[PDB]
Design a protein around this ligand. Structure first.
Ligand SMILES: C=CC1=C(C)/C(=C/c2[nH]c(/C=C3N=C(/C=C4\NC(=O)C(C)=C4C=C)C(C)=C\3CCC(=O)O)c(CCC(=O)O)c2C)NC1=O
Length: 238
């Protein structure tokens, strides 16, 4: 796992670069194994109205995380994207870590991050709540409203338009905190019963189903069949 061979990192919005480096630093601490995507989908290049569209996908796995995906994209000249999900192995009942940034050369327009509950409770595990509790509330001046296809998200979800670099740094630090808690608990987690495993797996199907609400730009560049394969095999496999 390493981003030093990325062709995109040097032209991506700096908060995106920061967050990618922070996710890498986190994941490098896990016993990562490679996760194979379709051969053509590791590195994607096309055109979107005459401007280069480029996507780099990196995917890993652990016994606790079925699929760890980091996507970076430059979707023509005025859109940069980071999308990251860690899909937990449902046997372990961990929450879904997710984060997305949408940016341009002018700055960041949306940043979101959560540890999303898989538990039919919609609660996070006790150890997460206690560790999260001791961090305290970060302050944000523009918090955005979740569409109806929330709250597959948790109470700790941040969904914002950063107002200045201090908010960019605060957003990234909260993701670094989320990851420190998450990785640590993954190392300590024990297999659930079959019943609760299936419960968690359904929470994961529902989370991926809901998130089908990105397509449009991919359809525009690649068509609808390519887009629907990408959504169902790369992004949000069910
Ligand atoms: C390479 C793939 C890819 C493309 C081409 C892409 C495009 C894309 N994402 C957008 C926004 C967005 N996209 C998301 C979020 C997500 N999007 C997701 O696929 C997931 C899983 C989330 C997480 C919830 C959010 C929250 C916005 C808000 C737009 C903004 O406020 O800037 C917009 C709005 C810009 C506009 O139309 O004016 C475009 C064009 N996003 C992509 O990921």
């Amino acid at each position: 796992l390493s981003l030093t061979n990325s062709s995109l990192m040097p032209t991506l919005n700096p908060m995106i670069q920061q967050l990618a480096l922070a996710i890498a630093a986190s994941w490098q601490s896990l016993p990562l194994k490679p996760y194979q995507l379709p051969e053509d989908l590791g590195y994607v290049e096309g055109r979107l109205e005459g401007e280069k569209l480029v996507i780099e996908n990196r995917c890993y796995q652990t016994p606790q995380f079925r699929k760890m995906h980091l996507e970076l994209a430059k979707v023509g000249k005025g859109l940069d994207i980071l999308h990251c999900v860690m899909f937990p192995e449902p046997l372990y009942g961990l929450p879904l870590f997710g984060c997305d940034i949408v940016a341009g050369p002018g700055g960041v327009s949306a940043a979101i991050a959560d540890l999303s509950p898989t538990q039919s409770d919609r609660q996070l595990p006790a150890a997460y709540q206690k560790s999260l509790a001791e961090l305290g509330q970060p302050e944000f001046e523009q918090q955005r409203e979740l569409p109806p296809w929330g709250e597959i998200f948790s109470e700790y979800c941040l969904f914002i338009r950063p107002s200045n670099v201090t908010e960019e740094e605060r957003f990234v630090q909260r993701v670094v905190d989320f990851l420190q808690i998450h990785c640590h608990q993954s190392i300590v987690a024990e297999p659930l019963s079959e019943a609760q495993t299936l419960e968690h797996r359904q929470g994961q199907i529902h989370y991926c189903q809901q998130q089908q609400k990105t397509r449009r730009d991919l359809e525009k560049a690649f068509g609808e069949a390519w887009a629907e394969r990408y959504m169902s095999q790369v992004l949000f496999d069910v």
